[PDB]
Design a protein around this ligand. Structure first.
Ligand SMILES: N#Cc1c(C(F)(F)F)cc(-c2cccs2)nc1S[C@@H](C(=O)O)c1ccccc1
Ligand SMILES: N#Cc1c(C(F)(F)F)cc(-c2cccs2)nc1S[C@@H](C(=O)O)c1ccccc1
Ligand SMILES: [Cl-]
Ligand SMILES: [Cl-]
Lengths: 125, 5, 125, 5
């Protein structure tokens, strides 16, 4: 309908509550393994943020897996920063992690993160 | 909050 | 970290993608039954929006149910409008549905919706 | 979009 009203803060409040569920380990349904570091998450949030996870969890066989192992070249801290960004909209981008975050965002197909990483790197060159 | 989107 | 950058549109893009998953029936894990009308949804989104669903899906027995039957006094159209609001931030509030939406929001413990309904009713009195 | 929150 064209007659709707909108609650401005709704989407951020939903994201804040999904993050709360993740911290309390409520209804998490997948473990992402990155070089033996394990991260519990919600498949729907991963699919909503990452082109790679969207492709994974829409596959008729992988949709049922409770563990997903990422490529061993992926940095666990880079993945952690990206998972926090998925659940909070905030990216902890630092000189010491930018290359790992950018490489991880390229792999996860998170184009907005790749774009800001490219801009920060270009600014330092 | 509420607004006209 | 206090050094984070934030992507303003992230939370709304996540919500838009969760709604897309719902429309395509991807990874929906519960059917909410309202007077024999059935609504497929994601438990995490319901818990993130509604105090009632948060209480339901954090219960050690109900967390495992794939069907939840609501009170027969709940109006299916009112529930539909609220479920759409959960997934989009937009509330289709109309003269013909405001009482049903308000009663449903009180039952689902969705205080911001109850508040706008009270304001619209008070304005017409 | 990116901002300082
Ligand atoms: N923790 C927690 C929590 C969540 C969460 F989803 F994050 F788990 C949701 C809610 C509500 C949603 C709507 C009204 S109250 N209340 C609490 S407490
Ligand atoms: N439908 C659909 C869809 C979704 C959804 F989650 F809604 F299912 C997500 C995505 C992406 C997320 C990040 C990059 S692309 N792409 C598509 S297509
Ligand atoms: Cl992104
Ligand atoms: Cl609400």
């Amino acid at each position: 309908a064209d007659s709707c009203i909108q609650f401005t803060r709704h989407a951020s409040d939903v994201l804040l509550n999904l993050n709360r569920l993740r911290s309390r380990d409520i209804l998490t349904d997948v473990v992402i393994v990155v070089s033996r570091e394990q991260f519990r998450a919600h498949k729907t949030v991963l699919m909503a943020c990452s082109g790679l996870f969207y492709s994974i969890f829409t596959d008729q066989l992988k949709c049922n897996l409770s563990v997903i192992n990422l490529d061993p070249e992926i940095n666990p801290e880079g993945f952690c920063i990206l998972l926090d960004f998925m659940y909070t909209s905030r990216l902890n981008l630092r000189e010491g992690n930018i290359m790992a975050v950018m490489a991880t965002a390229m792999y996860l197909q998170m184009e907005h993160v790749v774009d800001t990483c490219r801009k920060f790197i270009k600014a330092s060159e | 909050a509420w607004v006209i989107p």
